[PDB]
Design a binder for this molecule. Structure first.
Ligand SMILES: [Cl-]
Length: 303
């Protein structure tokens, strides 16, 4: 009985995941999430804020204690490329190494994509030529592969927060805004088109869609992981949300968190346009992604 852990340092939250390797199988035994907003003012000041840094470090010390407590044999900590936008990123990483004892790697979208594909290969085993569509954190990675072998990763920086602020100046958006919205996705997605047999979608938007479609509430990974969503099902939710204000979306559908109520429409559009462009009628939904993939990679180095 061995254990592995991963720590994901994002612009919004710091997340810990510990899994156990029992009977030659990976299972999550502990999780923790903490909002520290490390990306605050990085845009206007170009620097990580001292208060955000201090809190993040304190949460990391906490997670390290949990990791040592559970006596984890292998651990890996990663941070989003976004931190690269701060001139004091390296000082922050260095502080984390000395004070917490964690060597954080700022991974590229390509690395992120690989870890996410890894989690899918292990937890779903998609058939034939696979394409993983991971939306979240300000971008959407399109990863191609066969079995555990990743072929290529193509990352597009089309964050839903960015797209919503860019195209939907109104709440809900006007038909023209929506129209301009899709025109952009078509232009960008058409350039990534390739032949694939199985599409797997990852991220908050897609797991929320599955929860909506299959009436899952509260959220339960077991009832969402592996669920199938057709273009029609996804289109139905897109049409339901585009007709009402974000506030109503979260009020009428408990699966939609208020914080996501507004930007989710843009997220749904990404998957919609993706299926259309790649000429596929459906996709499989995965609850596992980056954070779990790091676990799979660490587990593979262990056996
Ligand atoms: Cl995003």
């Amino acid at each position: 009985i061995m254990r592995v852990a991963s720590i994901d340092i994002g612009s919004y939250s710091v997340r810990l995941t510990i899994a156990q390797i029992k009977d030659g199988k990976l299972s999550i035994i502990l999780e923790r999430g903490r909002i520290t907003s490390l990306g605050t003012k990085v845009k206007e000041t170009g620097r990580l804020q001292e208060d955000r840094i201090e809190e993040t470090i304190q949460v990391l010390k906490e997670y390290k204690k949990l990791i040592d407590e559970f006596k984890v044999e292998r651990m890996k900590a990663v941070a989003t490329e976004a931190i690269r936008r701060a001139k004091n990123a390296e000082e922050f990483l260095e502080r984390v190494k000395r004070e917490v004892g964690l060597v954080v790697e700022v991974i590229t979208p390509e690395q992120e994509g690989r870890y996410a594909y890894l989690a899918v290969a292990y937890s779903l085993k998609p058939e034939g030529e696979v394409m993983v569509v991971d939306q979240g954190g300000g971008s959407t990675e399109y990863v191609f592969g066969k079995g555990y072998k990743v072929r290529e990763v193509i990352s597009l920086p089309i964050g839903i927060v960015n797209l919503t602020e860019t195209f939907f100046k109104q709440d809900p958006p006007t038909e023209e805004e929506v129209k301009r919205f899709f025109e952009f996705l078509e232009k960008e997605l058409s350039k990534v088109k390739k032949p694939v047999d199985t599409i797997v979608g990852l991220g908050g938007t897609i797991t929320t869609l599955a929860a909506l479609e299959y009436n899952v509430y509260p959220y339960d990974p077991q009832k969402v992981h592996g669920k199938v969503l057709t273009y029609g099902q996804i289109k139905k939710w897109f049409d339901t949300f585009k007709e009402i204000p974000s506030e109503e979306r979260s009020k009428r559908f408990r699966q939609v968190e208020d914080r996501r109520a507004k930007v989710i429409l843009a997220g749904i559009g990404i998957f919609l346009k993706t299926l259309e462009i790649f000429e596929k009628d459906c996709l499989i939904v995965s609850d596992w992604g980056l954070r779990e993939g790091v676990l799979v990679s660490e587990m593979l180095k262990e056996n």
